[PDB]
Structures are given as C-alpha cells and as structure tokens.
Design a protein around this ligand. Structure first.
Ligand SMILES: COC(=O)[C@H](c1ccccc1)[C@H]1CCCCN1
Ligand SMILES: *[C@@H]1O[C@H](CO)[C@@H](O)[C@H](O)[C@H]1NC(C)=O
Ligand SMILES: *[C@@H]1O[C@H](CO)[C@@H](O)[C@H](O)[C@H]1NC(C)=O
Ligand SMILES: [Cl-]
Ligand code: NA
Ligand code: NA
Length: 545
C-alpha cells in the first residue's frame, strides 16, 4: 500500500518537469557559443553516452526495485547509508535559496500588468543621476528599485527584509505546501500544466523572435563548427561538468519518483525517453535566446559577445529590454514571466518531495502524519529563506549558489555508484533488473556501471577541487569568512558518510569479522551470513563484471 502513481503519464511528466529548470534554457546555448558551437556537441555526446545514461538508468532501476526513498534503498549495503542523508541535505540546501528567483519572477509578473513598463526609461525615484537613457535603465530598475542593492555594503551589512518580496515568498510557499500535502495523488495532476506551459510559451517566443531583423545573424553565431577547439583542455572539462550537472542525479528525486512505480514496468525505455527529451529541450531553446540577442546586437551596433550575459542578469535585465521595444509589449512580458514562474515551480516541488519521502521512509512515526511534516518542512524553508530577501540578499544568493550544490553532488554520485557496482555487484543488479523487466542488461551497461563511470566521476571531482575560484558579484570581493562558511556548508553536506559509517560499525556486536560481515553484506543475505558464507569475503566477487 505504497500509493503508486494514478497514471503512468504522471511519472514521466513529473520527471520531465523536475529536469527542465530555469538554468536549462540558457546555460547550454551559452556553453555551445563559447566553446566553438556545433563542434562542442562531440565531447558532450561522448561523455553523455558513456556516463549520463548509465547513471540515470541505475538510479531509476534502484529506486523501482527497492521500493523505498533515497536513504531506504541502502539495505543492499548498510554501511553506506549516509549518502542518502547527504543527498537529502543537498536538496534542502538548494531549496533554501531556489525559492527567491520565483519570488522575483512573481514580482516582475505583478509589475508587468500596466500600460507603461517601469524599466523603459530612468525618470523615477530609483535612478542615479548618470544613466544611459552610466548603467542602463533596465539594470538600474532591477538592482535599484527591486533588490535595493545600493543600500548594502556587502554580506556583512544586510539590513531588514523587504515586505514586497516577503509577500511573494509567502505566496510561493503557500502554493508549494498545497501542491504537496496529499502525496503523489494530487502532485501528479499539477504537473499536467506546469510541465507543458513552457513549451507553449517557447513556441510563440520562437515564432516572434525568428521574424526580428538580425535574428539570423544571431543564429549563425550559435551553430558554426570549428573542430580546432577540441585541441584545448577546457572544452572537454566544460562538457564533462555540464553533463554531470545537467541531469537530475545526485538529489534523490529520481529514487523517490521511481519508488512509486509498479514493480513490473520497463524503466529502460522511460530513462531513454526522459533523457532524450531533456537533452533536446535545451538545444531547441537555444534558438530563441540567440535570435533575440542578435536582434539586440543589431539594434545597438555591438558584437553579440558583449550582449550575451549570464546568471540572473540575463533573464531579468537583457530579456525584458528587447520586449519593451516590441509592439504589444505588455502581453509579451506577461507571458514571458508566466513561463519563467512555471519553469521553476516543478523543480522546487520535486526537491521538497525528495526530502519528505526520504525522511518519512526512515521514521515510521511520520506516517499518516504527512500534512504536519510537510507544514513543518515548508515553514522551516520559509524561515531560512528570509536571508535572501534583505537589502544585500544577492550576496547570500550568490554564495549559496556557489557552495550548496558543487563538489558534493559528484562525491555523492561517485559513492553511490561504487556502492551499487562494487559492494553489491553488477551481476546482482542485472539479476534484479531481469526480475523486474523481462530482459537482462548487456555487457556494455555493466562495463559502464563498473569501470567507466567511477573513473570519470573521480576525475571530475579532482578537477573540480583543483580548479577553484571564489565567487563574486560585479566588483565586490567576498571576505575570508564567507569562503570559510561556504566550505563549512559543503563539508557538512559531504561528511555524512564517515560519521554514519563509524556509528554503524561501532553499534554492531561481536568481533571485527562479524561486524564487517554484517556491515557490508545485504540484508537479504542474512541467513548466509549467519551460516558463515559471505560473498564479499572473496577475491572472485570483486573481479566479476
Ligand atoms: C541549483 O538548482 C538546481 O540544481 C535544480 C534544483 C532546484 C530545486 C531543488 C533541487 C534542485 C536542479 C533541477 C534538476 C536538474 C539539475 N538542477
Ligand atoms: C523626465 O521628466 C521630465 C518631466 O516629466 C522631463 O522634463 C525630462 O526630460 C524627463 N527626462 C527623462 C530622462 O526622461
Ligand atoms: C553614477 O552615480 C552613482 C550614484 O550617484 C555614483 O556612485 C557613480 O560613481 C556614478 N558613476 C558615474 C560614471 O558617473
Ligand atoms: Cl542542460
Ligand atoms: Na522545472
Ligand atoms: Na537541465
């Protein structure tokens, strides 16, 4: 009685909605433009084929077979149960700050319901004497009339929270609570709108932007192969990092979503379809951004390089600046901000569902008490998200975005891959998959699970640690204690594995050998362990593909 999905289309839509987030539609086209373009697809496709698909398949299959949450699937290796807490903490940390972009989108949407947009000129009370008519009026409106950033001196001078953004945060929190309090029976029908509206808005945006003058010259700059940029060891690193960070792995959301699936459904086809859709969405959406950027560059007589920005300064400054020059600008602004709002609401409920399912599956007291636990979680998230709505909240946002999910997601994914493929065994995993579906994975999948994925993940982790630069916002330089706090957050997320491993080893009874045997063997093999035969205590178990 684990409350399976109402329909199968509810699962696919939920996964697609979680995967497609705000960063999906701007990061990949910019990365393609920077690293050649067209030729950048070769490292991306190679790394994707050899790393991303096997990890997606492994997560889906593990979640579906074990019928539990992120921390409950570790009855196959009891000593490695800390990685579930690690991924839950990562999701909580990301959600602590991902709910402020949606508040900004709500603020802009409410402000766009007028016959004269407030960011078209600088004659208001929030504009400095020097102006473009000197920073542009759009940027001045964004970071001087909305954020009120000019009243802060850094992360050590924050100030009281702003009520105009606190109201939007409250609205977002109320929507999040009422979209998740009854489980997946109601959460699977919400995604019928939020996972399909972005495509409807993007089609109209592309149709409008294609006809703009100079949009073709912005598209040619997007798809122009080089093939001589593959000789530099910066394109491959960027491709590997993008492959690692573009999938939904490392959060525990996929395991939680799969735990509600039927036992005998086919997860291979589902993984293939979801991955194909997620990868095609970014490539397709790259056609609108660069058409608009080419239109703007032709308007200002400047190269596209100086126009193509990144981060929150693109969708809140650059995009609502070309719209104001279009006929019927208010309607276009309204639909654009509706799309922005609906594109990151299903990536914030997926993370919350991951946390809630993972914590409920462990303690049985929080069973049938689903509304109260959800209320407590959303209240805690709202309380801890009040730091980013102050005068200097953009600094806290930048710090959290830099340190919350990075070098820890890769660590958790590598640990879980090692646990699944080495401690448990690829043979047992293949037998379980053959038990669920009707067919056994081939040699390619087992080889990728055992050898290629761990080495790739370890190389990515090492290159992420070695090449590290502190965050910044404009000309501001963060102090030392901010970097110390970021490192403390990252290490606190990552340090769940050793502490739980030590506690588990110390709690078990007996001598060293019995403790080890009960700690590394699956809970389903308890009879064999009691009899005295352990699979892991042999040479042939670790050298088997
Ligand atoms: C920094 O924001 C994020 O990484 C997104 C997220 C948002 C809210 C809760 C958890 C994760 C994920 C969505 C899936 C694809 C990878 N990005
Ligand atoms: C601002 O408004 C005043 C009066 O409405 C006008 O004289 C002035 O030219 C305007 N300046 C700009 C930059 O809009
Ligand atoms: C623009 O005005 C702001 C506020 O008065 C000031 O801090 C800044 O130095 C000025 N910059 C220029 C280039 O005039
Ligand atoms: Cl992407
Ligand atoms: Na999303
Ligand atoms: Na993505």
């Amino acid at each position: 009685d684990r409350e399976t999905w109402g329909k199968k289309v509810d699962f696919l839509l939920s996964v697609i909605g979680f995967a497609v987030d705000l960063a999906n539609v701007w990061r990949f086209p910019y990365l393609c433009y920077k690293n050649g373009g067209g030729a950048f697809l070769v490292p991306y496709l190679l790394f994707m084929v050899i790393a991303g698909m096997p990890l997606f398949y492994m997560e889906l299959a593990l979640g579906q077979f074990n019928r539990e949450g992120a921390a409950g699937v570790w009855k196959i290796c009891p000593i490695l149960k800390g990685v579930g807490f690690t991924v839950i903490l990562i999701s909580l940390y990301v959600g602590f700050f991902y709910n402020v972009i949606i508040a900004w989108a709500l603020h802009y949407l409410f402000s766009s319901f007028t016959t004269e947009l407030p960011w078209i000129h600088c004659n208001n009370s929030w504009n400095s004497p020097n102006c473009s008519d000197g920073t542009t009026p759009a940027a001045e409106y964004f970071e001087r009339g909305v954020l009120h950033l000019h009243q802060s001196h850094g992360i050590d001078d924050l100030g009281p929270p702003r009520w105009q953004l606190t109201a939007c945060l409250v609205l977002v929190i109320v929507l999040l609570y009422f979209s998740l309090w009854k489980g997946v029976k109601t959460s699977g029908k919400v995604v019928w709108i939020t996972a399909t509206m972005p495509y409807v808005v993007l089609t109209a945006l592309l149709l409008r932007g294609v006809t703009l003058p100079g949009a073709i010259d912005g598209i040619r700059a997007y798809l122009s192969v080089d093939f001589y940029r593959l000789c530099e060891a910066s394109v491959w690193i960027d491709a590997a990092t993008q492959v690692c960070f573009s999938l939904g792995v490392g959060f525990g959301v996929l395991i939680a979503f799969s735990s509600y699936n039927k036992f005998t459904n086919n997860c291979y086809r589902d993984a293939i379809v979801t991955t194909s859709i997620n990868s095609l969405t970014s490539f397709s959406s790259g056609f609108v951004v660069f058409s608009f950027l080419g239109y703007m560059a032709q308007k200002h007589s400047v190269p596209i390089g100086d126009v193509a920005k990144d981060g929150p300064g693109l969708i809140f400054i650059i995009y609502p600046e070309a719209i104001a020059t279009l006929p019927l600008s208010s309607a276009w602004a309204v639909v654009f901000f509706i799309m922005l709002l609906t594109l990151g609401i299903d990536s914030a409920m997926g993370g919350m569902e991951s946390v809630i399912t993972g914590l409920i599956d462990e303690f049985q007291l929080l069973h049938r008490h689903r509304e109260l636990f959800t209320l407590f979680i959303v209240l805690a998230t709202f309380l801890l998200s009040l730091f980013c709505v102050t005068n200097g909240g953009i600094y806290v946002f930048t710090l959290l975005d830099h340190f919350a999910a990075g070098t820890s997601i890769l660590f958790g994914v590598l640990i879980e891959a090692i646990g699944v493929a080495w401690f448990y065994g690829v043979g047992q995993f293949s037998d379980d998959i053959q038990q669920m579906t009707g067919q056994r994975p081939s040699l390619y999948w087992r080889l990728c699970w055992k050898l290629v994925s761990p080495c790739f993940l370890l190389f990515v982790v090492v290159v992420s640690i070695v090449t590290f630069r502190p965050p910044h916002y404009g000309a501001y330089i963060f102090p030392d204690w901010a970097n110390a706090l970021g490192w403390v957050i990252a290490t606190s997320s990552m340090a769940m594995v050793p502490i739980y491993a030590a506690y588990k080893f110390c709690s078990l009874p007996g001598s060293f050998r019995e403790k080890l045997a009960y700690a590394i063997a699956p809970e389903k093999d308890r009879e064999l362990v009691d009899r005295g035969e352990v699979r892991q205590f042999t040479l042939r178990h670790w050298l088997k593909v």
